[PDB]
Amino acid sequence: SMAYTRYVDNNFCGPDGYPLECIKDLLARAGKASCTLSEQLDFIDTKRGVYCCREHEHEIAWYTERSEKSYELQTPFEIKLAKKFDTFNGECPNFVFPLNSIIKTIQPRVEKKKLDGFMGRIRSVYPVASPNECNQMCLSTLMKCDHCGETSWQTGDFVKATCEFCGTENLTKEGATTCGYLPQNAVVKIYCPACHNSEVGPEHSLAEYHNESGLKTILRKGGRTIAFGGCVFSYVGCHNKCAYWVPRASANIGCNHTGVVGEGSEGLNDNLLEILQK
Ligand SMILES: [Zn+2]
Ligand SMILES: [Zn+2]
Ligand SMILES: [Zn+2]
Numbered sequence: 001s002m003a004y005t006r007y008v009d010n011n012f013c014g015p016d017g018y019p020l021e022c023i024k025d026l027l028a029r030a031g032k033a034s035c036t037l038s039e040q041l042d043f044i045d046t047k048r049g050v051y052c053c054r055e056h057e058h059e060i061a062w063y064t065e066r067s068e069k070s071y072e073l074q075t076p077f078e079i080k081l082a083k084k085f086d087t088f089n090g091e092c093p094n095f096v097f098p099l100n101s102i103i104k105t106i107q108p109r110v111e112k113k114k115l116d117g118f119m120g121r122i123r124s125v126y127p128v129a130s131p132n133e134c135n136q137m138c139l140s141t142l143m144k145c146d147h148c149g150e151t152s153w154q155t156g157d158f159v160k161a162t163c164e165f166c167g168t169e170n171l172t173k174e175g176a177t178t179c180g181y182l183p184q185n186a187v188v189k190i191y192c193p194a195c196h197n198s199e200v201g202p203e204h205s206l207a208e209y210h211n212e213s214g215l216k217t218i219l220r221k222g223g224r225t226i227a228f229g230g231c232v233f234s235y236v237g238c239h240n241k242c243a244y245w246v247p248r249a250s251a252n253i254g255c256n257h258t259g260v261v262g263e264g265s266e267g268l269n270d271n272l273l274e275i276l277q278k
Helices: 021-029 037-046 117-122 206-213 265-276
Strands: 007-009 059-065 081-084 101-105 139-144 151-156 160-162 169-171 186-191 226-228 231-239 242-252
Touching (some): 117 242
Antiparallel strands (some): 081 101, 151 160, 231 242
16 A cells, blocks of 8 residues: 555555555546445456556455445455455465455444543443453564574564563564464553653643654554554553554454464465364
8 A cells, every 4th residue: 555566456455455546546537536446446447457557567466355435445444355366376475464364343332421531442442341351462473583593483562572482572573473362352552652751641642642652654544553463453542651452453264363464474374274173
């Protein structure tokens, strides 16, 4: 969903599950910005499909089932199923979800008399009496350790994980990720710079959190988003100077496992599937 990227699903959305600017422009110029996805994809095929943008090339790596919402409005949250495109030969690039997966998106909760502070914010996602009922997820990154130089599944969150071998804390590196088995009231709870630092404070805005978080997000339709381990995370709010993210979208490859995404994920998922059968 950058300016241009080659690889798309059969619905012409990018590897991050978001629409391409170039395709959005093409649809706008033809006066089909607010048409259904089916009608926009009919028109894209009229413009020669993956060659629809004359000045660069696209290539379909994934089959995905999405909603009928206008291309411009499509998000990872609109994906329901993800697999390799039947007619694409070779290894797929990195994709927001694991192959042969089903996706569930969190519905925003309705509440007559909304609670104050974090309780109102978290109850917009999960029906919990307290924050204690939320279960923090196990986000694992297959990466090399700064200390012992072993490459293993290090467990933690989006930003940091711990080496099982030597116990050294490592910043999350590029490589295969997983959110493991999705628990009930699944949350990611991380240190909040905006809460802790004396310049901002724990009554900071939603905007202020993202400004000070040090995490890479883009303000886009569906809100600011972080993709990790076969989930797409949205920011709920802060409780006790800790930022709470929820898997607004979560993949399921079987047994409620969020599966593996990133370098080598196809091999790792195939190996994982043979365990989950048992
Ligand atoms: Zn294009
Ligand atoms: Zn280590
Ligand atoms: Zn905060």
